[PDB]
DNA sequence: ACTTGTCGGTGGTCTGCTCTAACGTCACGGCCAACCGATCGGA
DNA sequence: TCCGATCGGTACCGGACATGTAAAGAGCAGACCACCGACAAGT
């Protein structure tokens, strides 16, 4: 971290002393275009060391509509948006704000490119929430709960709650075959 | 690399293969495989007369090698790939739409790689990533596993829409389903003339 | 050559959905607190009910009696 | 039975830490929610409630809770071997598998006319082992499809 | 037995057409046409008569302004 | 050039016949007079303005989204009312 | 397009670049086919109505112009070209790679056209194109005698 | 008969040309997305400055915005005496 | 030798005998050619359009073929004016009965 | 006397982007379980 | 010269049909619309 800060200071000295400045020495400028590019090697070992905490999370997301590959790519941009903003000053280990940086990228990007039609985070967010409610009142009634009742405990019109059921379905394949032998399409 | 760099040149995946086509002599090569042919014998005959065939094909024709790799993947019209809305608001897919969509993802990923300066290793896995959609998109199957949809079931790319009794050719070319025609059972009728 | 009646089909049905159910329920346990959890709120039932409805809707042995006269049936 | 097999089957849930656990037991199903001639003319489903009692053990405190678990709506069989499914009685049909076990199979090629033995061991859920002889009298093993 | 010819009779002179392809469906319930398949192509080129095949590929199937214009004819 | 009174009888007539609400749009393309603004916001102004001198009136307009399915709002004029 | 009788030859080829994005009318951007909320299709997507039709007749995407007047004109505002819903299936677009792919017809074949042009074995191109090793395109033999 | 139009050249960076028909009584507007993809102008002597837009955040300014001047001076200093000491002993 | 058929492939007698009155003839050595039975799913996969050949059967591979060699179909024959819906050259549709 | 293009303000709704700091670091899952014929690439 | 992989194929008319999961939340900003104040010029 040290490292790639010095070499970020050393870029941002020497691009400004570029233009409207001065000639600058010339083992300076070595020594600015060392530390720039000891930066550069330090920044590609780091986000190639912790290569693993990315394919660890994406674990868990297997299965929901992204590729395995796909989710580890997400990972690695969070890793790189992590080690853009790592600060060592406070001295907490990287790897918490890793975790938060890959588990946000991942969540974000398994939100948006996941469905044929797409659907806004700010309503991905209140499906989950209507799907979390409706999971309590059915464990604690006993019975599948009505819609009166869901609109009820998500303080929403019961108009609603049938909007938001209706956005969550996925359309099917026009391919699928309809009778037992693969002889017609849908 | 390190120590020998101002004496070679080497690359990894298509763009290696689209500067070795574009050093491609194919007069020289030719000439050799003729007198390969017209001079040797053996096993390497064989060989000598395929890429013979292959380089005269490439050769006699006006066209280039440099058709095999590919900068741009056309987009087959709408019409052809419908999404229509089944009766009580289902949606139905042509199954190309996921493939694009795939195809069309992994590809703004590398832009946005490219951009930020990812490391050699991410890079080079994304192109990979991208050249098996592109791949599974014009043929699935042909290399590695399948592209597995909702249910398990391969998805249909063009090269299944043109091959099989289910292919285009076979299904609506030479047979195609006709207006004015009936269809009952037949009983037998002594009282009938010939015709 | 074994066979496999209507039980077992269900019981295989059931077996799956509580696997999957399992893998939810060990995703979940490394993520909530502990000293704050119940039972309830770690069990997800809908992957079994669903696995469940699949067989029953979907499956190539679950067919529409015929029903043309006793015997057919 | 089925139920009770299964939930013994996943009774041990354990993490890899191995300090929690969670257990499934004794499962019990209520009354019916309608009969049979009510679900048909209302286009519903002949099931039945089923509720599972589960419980969660902390291994390093050593507490434990207990409470019911609704499980949801188990199809039911009617007195005529029907399921009753939106309406429609369903019908399901026994199928004829190949049990596990271990099978001995003899070939004669055409080449040396030369007979050749080989075992399939053929388990529920698990990987395939298989031993052979070819013509040159070597006995191999094919461990899954290597 | 259950084949009876008030289930089984079928005529069409111009009804649904599909999509992708502008063909007719098929199906009773759909009102479809029967199908002209390839073996039928064997037989009608087999006879020598090329304007019939030739109307039946066509202007019953897929000329799309074809079909309109015999129709209006 | 249309003149104020016709506008605005125009616009109640195309109001009260129709059956389903009508966004800001569909009053502009299709009602008569409205056709003639320079700009989105002088026409904003112009409808705003001659909606609040109908309101003044009495009529009772009705102010609801389109469709269940879309979020655009529409206007409607009760018959009943 | 008519006088079937006129047809002489139907000759098929290789298709370079330039024709790929000579055939197509727009590139796609975004992997978008339809609004979750009004159903109408989206902007530079699957769909997209400035790129290949409109989806009424004589109507464009805003709906600025909806009369049969408009013949051959496109929309100032949304770029919707004013013609009938039946060239949706007639216009193409293309996608612009980031890098090149090689096609799999020409690799994946038995033979393999490219491994008999380039002299490779199969494995060695797979190994080549889906990067597992390196290939050496040229050397300077002259500068490596030399030194 | 058919209503009267207009025709708009544009052309693209890499010298491309399009036309693009347009109505008489409309705005022409500056800046067309052309049939390859790329952003073009209206090639003519008055040219229609269109609205410039500001270059977004980098790594730089997420660094400075986090740190101080100070600080990234001191390491630097530090730095380049920690170099020196290696190169020259 | 100085013909234009590459070695070792199947080409027509009448093709063969035409390029070599065409060859000795104002030319060179003219080509030396042996009879060759061939089985009924090799011969009609080897037609001169690659439009019957890949509604035939292989059509990956007869596309191939066909794109690398560039071939022109002169539409000449019963399946291929079939799919075009052109008249089929028998029957009544040849030009002495049309 | 009445009306309108031009100017500026509030509050609500839909939509998108950036951020969160104990420690956490290389996936199961496995179908396949046919049958014959022809062809290219290793041993 | 022999042989473990890989790819090509396997009749027709009638009919039938539509998915089963989500580890979140907060702060700030941008675009658009329903409600409004002024102010001089044309009607
Ligand atoms: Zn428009």
């Given at each position: 971290?040290?490292?790639?800060e010095?070499?970020?200071?050393?870029?941002?000295?020497?691009?400004?002393?570029?233009?409207?400045?001065?000639?600058?020495?010339?083992?300076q400028?070595?020594?600015?275009?060392?530390?720039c590019?000891?930066?550069?090697?330090?920044?590609?070992?780091?986000?190639?060391?912790?290569?693993?905490?990315?394919?660890?999370?994406?674990?868990?997301?297997?299965?929901?509509?992204?590729?395995?590959?796909?989710?580890?790519?997400?990972?690695?941009?969070?890793?790189?948006?992590?080690?853009?903003?790592?600060?060592?000053?406070?001295?907490?280990?990287?790897?918490?704000?890793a975790?938060?940086?890959?588990?946000?990228?991942?969540?974000?990007?398994?939100?948006?490119?996941?469905?044929?039609?797409?659907?806004?985070?700010?309503?991905?967010?209140?499906?989950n929430?209507?799907?979390?409610?409706?999971?309590?009142?059915?464990?604690?009634?006993?019975?599948?709960?009505?819609?009166?009742?869901?609109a009820?405990?998500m303080?929403?019109?019961?108009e609603?709650?049938?909007?938001?059921?209706?956005?969550?379905?996925?359309?099917?394949?026009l391919?699928?075959?309809?009778?037992?032998?693969?002889?017609?399409?849908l | 690399?390190?120590?020998?760099g101002?004496?070679?040149?080497?690359?990894?995946?298509?763009?290696?293969?689209?500067?070795?086509?574009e050093?491609?002599?194919?007069?020289?090569?030719?000439?050799?495989?003729?007198?390969?042919?017209?001079?040797?014998?053996?096993?390497?005959?064989?060989?000598?007369l395929?890429?013979?065939?292959?380089?005269?094909?490439?050769?006699?024709?006006?066209?280039?090698?440099?058709?095999?790799?590919?900068?741009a993947?056309?987009?087959?019209?709408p019409?052809?790939?419908?999404?229509?809305?089944?009766?009580?608001?289902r949606?139905?897919?042509?199954?190309?739409n996921?493939?694009?969509r795939?195809?069309?993802?992994?590809?703004?990923r590398?832009?946005?790689?490219?951009?930020?300066?990812?490391?050699?290793?991410?890079?080079?896995?994304?192109?990979?990533?991208?050249?098996?959609?592109?791949?599974?998109?014009?043929?699935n199957?042909?290399?590695?596993?399948?592209?597995?949809?909702?249910?398990?079931?391969?998805?249909?790319?063009?090269?299944?829409?043109?091959?099989?009794?289910?292919?285009?050719?076979?299904?609506?070319?030479?047979?195609?389903?006709?207006?004015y025609?009936?269809?009952?059972?037949?009983?037998?009728?002594?009282?009938?003339?010939?015709? | 050559?074994?066979?496999?009646?209507?039980?077992?089909?269900?019981?295989?049905?059931?077996?799956?959905?509580?696997?999957?159910?399992?893998?939810?329920?060990?995703?979940?346990?490394?993520?909530?607190?502990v000293?704050?959890?119940?039972?309830?709120t770690?069990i997800?039932?809908?992957?079994?009910?669903?696995?469940?409805?699949?067989?029953?809707?979907?499956?190539?042995?679950?067919?529409?009696?015929?029903?043309?006269?006793?015997?057919?049936? | 039975?089925?139920?009770?097999?299964?939930?013994?089957?996943?009774?041990?849930?354990?993490?890899?830490?191995?300090?929690?656990?969670?257990?499934?037991?004794?499962?019990?199903?209520?009354?019916?929610?309608?009969?049979?001639?009510?679900?048909?003319?209302?286009?519903?489903t002949?099931?039945?409630?089923?509720?599972?009692?589960?419980?969660?053990?902390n291994?390093?405190?050593?507490?434990?809770?207990?409470?019911?678990?609704?499980?949801?709506?188990?199809?039911?069989?009617?007195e005529?071997?029907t399921?009753?499914?939106?309406?429609?009685?369903?019908?399901?049909?026994?199928?004829?598998v190949?049990?596990?076990?271990?099978?001995?199979?003899?070939?004669?090629?055409?080449?040396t006319?030369?007979?050749?033995?080989?075992?399939?061991?053929?388990?529920?859920?698990?990987?395939?082992?298989?031993?052979?002889?070819?013509?040159?009298?070597?006995?191999?093993?094919?461990?899954?499809?290597? | 037995?259950?084949?009876?010819?008030?289930?089984?009779?079928?005529?069409?002179?111009?009804?649904?057409?599909?999509?992708?392809?502008?063909?007719?469906?098929?199906?009773?319930?759909?009102?479809?046409?029967?199908?002209?398949?390839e073996?039928?192509?064997?037989?009608?080129?087999?006879?020598?008569?090329?304007?019939?095949?030739?109307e039946?590929?066509?202007?019953?199937?897929?000329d799309?302004?074809?079909?309109?214009?015999?129709?209006?004819? | 050039?249309?003149?104020?009174?016709?506008?605005?009888?125009?616009?109640?007539?195309?109001?009260?016949s129709?059956?389903?609400?009508?966004?800001?749009?569909?009053?502009?393309?299709?009602?008569?007079?409205?056709?003639?603004?320079?700009?989105?916001?002088?026409?904003?102004?112009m409808?705003?303005r001659?909606?609040?001198?109908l309101?003044?009136?009495?009529?009772?307009?009705?102010?609801?989204?389109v469709?269940?399915?879309?979020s655009?709002?529409?206007?409607?004029?009760?018959?009943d009312? | 397009?008519?006088?079937?009788?006129?047809?002489?030859?139907?000759?098929?080829?290789?298709?370079?670049?330039?024709?790929?994005?000579?055939?197509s009318?727009?590139?796609?951007?975004?992997?978008?086919?339809?609004?979750?909320?009004?159903?109408?299709?989206?902007?530079?997507?699957?769909?997209?109505?400035?790129?290949?039709?409109?989806?009424?007749d004589?109507?464009?995407?805003?709906?600025?112009?909806?009369?049969?007047?408009?013949?051959?004109i496109?929309?100032?505002?949304?770029?919707?070209?004013?013609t009938?819903?039946?060239?949706?299936?007639?216009?193409?677009?293309?996608?612009?790679?980031?890098?090149?792919?090689?096609?799999?017809?020409?690799?994946?074949?038995?033979?393999?056209?490219?491994?008999?042009?380039?002299?490779?074995?199969?494995?060695?191109?797979?190994?080549?194109?889906?990067?597992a090793?390196?290939?050496?395109?040229?050397?300077?033999?002259?500068?490596?005698?030399?030194? | 008969?058919?209503?009267?139009?207009?025709?708009?050249?544009?052309?693209?960076?890499?010298?491309?040309?399009?036309?693009?028909?347009?109505?008489?009584?409309?705005?022409?507007?500056?800046?067309?997305?052309?049939?390859?993809?790329?952003?073009?102008?209206?090639?003519?002597?008055?040219?229609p400055?269109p609205?410039?837009?500001?270059?977004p955040?980098?790594?730089?300014?997420?660094?400075?915005?986090?740190?101080?001047?100070?600080?990234?001076?001191?390491?630097?200093?530090?730095?380049?005496?920690?170099?020196?000491?290696?190169?020259?002993? | 030798?100085?013909?234009?058929?590459?070695?070792?492939?199947?080409?027509?007698?009448?093709?063969?005998?035409?390029?070599?009155?065409?060859?000795?003839?104002?030319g060179?050595?003219?080509?030396?050619?042996?009879?060759?039975?061939?089985?009924?799913?090799?011969?009609?996969?080897?037609?001169?359009?690659?439009?019957?050949?890949?509604?035939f059967?292989?059509?990956?591979?007869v596309?191939?073929?066909?794109?690398?060699?560039?071939?022109?179909?002169?539409?000449?024959?019963?399946?291929?004016?079939?799919?075009?819906?052109?008249?089929?050259?028998?029957?009544?549709?040849?030009?002495?009965?049309?």
């Amino acid at each position: 971290a040290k490292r790639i800060e010095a070499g970020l200071y050393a870029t941002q000295k020497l691009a400004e002393l570029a233009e409207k400045g001065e000639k600058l020495p010339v083992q300076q400028r070595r020594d600015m275009q060392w530390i720039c590019r000891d930066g550069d090697r330090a920044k590609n070992h780091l986000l190639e060391a912790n290569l693993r905490l990315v394919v660890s999370l994406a674990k868990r997301y297997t299965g929901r509509g992204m590729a395995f590959l796909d989710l580890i790519q997400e990972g690695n941009l969070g890793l790189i948006r992590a080690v853009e903003k790592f600060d060592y000053t406070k001295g907490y280990k990287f790897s918490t704000y890793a975790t938060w940086w890959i588990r946000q990228a991942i969540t974000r990007a398994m939100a948006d490119q996941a469905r044929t039609i797409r659907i806004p985070v700010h309503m991905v967010e209140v499906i989950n929430k209507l799907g979390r409610i409706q999971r309590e009142l059915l464990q604690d009634l006993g019975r599948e709960p009505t819609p009166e009742e869901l609109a009820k405990e998500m303080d929403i019109t019961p108009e609603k709650v049938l909007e938001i059921q209706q956005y969550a379905r996925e359309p099917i394949s026009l391919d699928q075959t309809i009778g037992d032998e693969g002889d017609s399409q849908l | 690399q390190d120590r020998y760099g101002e004496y070679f040149t080497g690359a990894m995946g298509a763009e290696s293969i689209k500067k070795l086509i574009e050093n491609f002599d194919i007069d020289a090569e030719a000439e050799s495989l003729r007198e390969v042919i017209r001079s040797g014998k053996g096993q390497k005959k064989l060989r000598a007369l395929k890429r013979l065939k292959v380089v005269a094909a490439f050769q006699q024709s006006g066209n280039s090698p440099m058709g095999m790799v590919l900068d741009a993947v056309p987009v087959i019209p709408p019409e052809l790939r419908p999404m229509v809305q089944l009766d009580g608001g289902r949606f139905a897919t042509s199954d190309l739409n996921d493939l694009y969509r795939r195809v069309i993802n992994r590809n703004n990923r590398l832009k946005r790689l490219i951009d930020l300066g990812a490391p050699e290793i991410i890079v080079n896995n994304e192109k990979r990533m991208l050249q098996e959609s592109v791949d599974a998109l014009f043929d699935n199957g042909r290399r590695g596993r399948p592209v597995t949809g909702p249910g398990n079931r391969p998805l249909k790319s063009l090269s299944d829409l043109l091959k099989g009794k289910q292919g285009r050719f076979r299904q609506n070319l030479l047979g195609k389903r006709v207006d004015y025609s009936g269809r009952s059972v037949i009983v037998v009728g002594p009282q009938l003339k010939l015709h | 050559r074994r066979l496999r009646t209507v039980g077992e089909l269900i019981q295989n049905q059931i077996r799956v959905g509580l696997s999957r159910m399992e893998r939810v329920v060990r995703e979940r346990m490394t993520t909530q607190d502990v000293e704050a959890i119940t039972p309830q709120t770690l069990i997800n039932i809908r992957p079994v009910v669903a696995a469940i409805k699949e067989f029953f809707g979907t499956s190539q042995l679950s067919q529409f009696m015929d029903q043309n006269n006793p015997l057919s049936g | 039975g089925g139920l009770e097999e299964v939930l013994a089957e996943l009774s041990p849930i354990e993490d890899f830490s191995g300090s929690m656990s969670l257990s499934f037991s004794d499962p019990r199903f209520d009354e019916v929610k309608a009969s049979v001639d009510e679900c048909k003319d209302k286009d519903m489903t002949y099931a039945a409630p089923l509720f599972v009692t589960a419980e969660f053990i902390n291994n390093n405190t050593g507490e434990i809770k207990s409470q019911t678990v609704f499980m949801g709506d188990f199809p039911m069989m009617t007195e005529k071997g029907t399921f009753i499914i939106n309406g429609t009685e369903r019908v399901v049909v026994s199928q004829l598998v190949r049990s596990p076990g271990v099978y001995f199979d003899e070939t004669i090629d055409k080449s040396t006319e030369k007979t050749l033995h080989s075992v399939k061991v053929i388990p529920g859920r698990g990987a395939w082992l298989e031993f052979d002889v070819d013509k040159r009298d070597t006995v191999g093993v094919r461990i899954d499809r290597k | 037995l259950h084949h009876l010819v008030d289930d089984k009779i079928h005529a069409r002179s111009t009804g649904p057409y599909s999509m992708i392809t502008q063909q007719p469906l098929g199906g009773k319930a759909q009102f479809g046409g029967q199908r002209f398949g390839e073996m039928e192509c064997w037989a009608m080129q087999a006879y020598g008569a090329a304007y019939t095949l030739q109307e039946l590929l066509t202007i019953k199937s897929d000329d799309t302004v074809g079909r309109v214009k015999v129709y209006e004819a | 050039a249309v003149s104020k009174v016709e506008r605005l009888m125009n616009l109640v007539i195309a109001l009260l016949s129709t059956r389903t609400y009508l966004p800001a749009e569909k009053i502009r393309t299709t009602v008569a007079g409205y056709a003639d603004s320079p700009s989105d916001e002088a026409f904003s102004r112009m409808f705003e303005r001659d909606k609040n001198e109908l309101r003044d009136l009495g009529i009772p307009l009705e102010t609801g989204r389109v469709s269940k399915w879309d979020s655009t709002e529409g206007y409607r004029i009760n018959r009943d009312s | 397009m008519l006088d079937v009788n006129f047809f002489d030859e139907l000759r098929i080829g290789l298709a370079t670049a330039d024709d790929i994005r000579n055939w197509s009318y727009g590139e796609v951007k975004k992997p978008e086919t339809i609004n979750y909320r009004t159903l109408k299709p989206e902007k530079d997507g699957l769909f997209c109505e400035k790129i290949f039709g409109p989806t009424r007749d004589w109507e464009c995407y805003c709906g600025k112009y909806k009369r049969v007047r408009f013949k051959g004109i496109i929309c100032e505002r949304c770029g919707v070209e004013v013609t009938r819903a039946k060239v949706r299936r007639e216009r193409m677009g293309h996608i612009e790679l980031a890098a090149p792919v090689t096609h799999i017809w020409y690799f994946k074949g038995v033979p393999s056209r490219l491994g008999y042009l380039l002299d490779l074995a199969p494995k060695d191109l797979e190994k080549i194109i889906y990067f597992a090793a390196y290939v050496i395109t040229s050397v300077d033999d002259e500068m490596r005698h030399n030194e | 008969d058919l209503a009267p139009r207009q025709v708009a050249r544009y052309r693209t960076d890499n010298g491309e040309e399009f036309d693009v028909p347009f109505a008489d009584d409309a705005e022409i507007p500056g800046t067309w997305l052309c049939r390859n993809g790329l952003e073009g102008t209206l090639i003519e002597g008055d040219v229609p400055e269109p609205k410039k837009v500001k270059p977004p955040r980098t790594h730089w300014d997420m660094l400075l915005e986090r740190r101080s001047v100070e600080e990234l001076e001191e390491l630097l200093k530090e730095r380049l005496d920690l170099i020196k000491a290696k190169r020259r002993g | 030798g100085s013909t234009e058929f590459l070695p070792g492939s199947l080409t027509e007698r009448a093709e063969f005998e035409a390029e070599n009155r065409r060859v000795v003839a104002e030319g060179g050595e003219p080509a030396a050619g042996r009879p060759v039975l061939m089985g009924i799913t090799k011969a009609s996969l080897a037609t001169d359009s690659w439009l019957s050949a890949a509604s035939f059967q292989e059509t990956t591979r007869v596309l191939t073929d066909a794109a690398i060699n560039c071939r022109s179909d002169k539409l000449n024959g019963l399946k291929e004016n079939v799919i075009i819906g052109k008249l089929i050259p028998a029957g009544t549709g040849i030009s002495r009965y049309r």
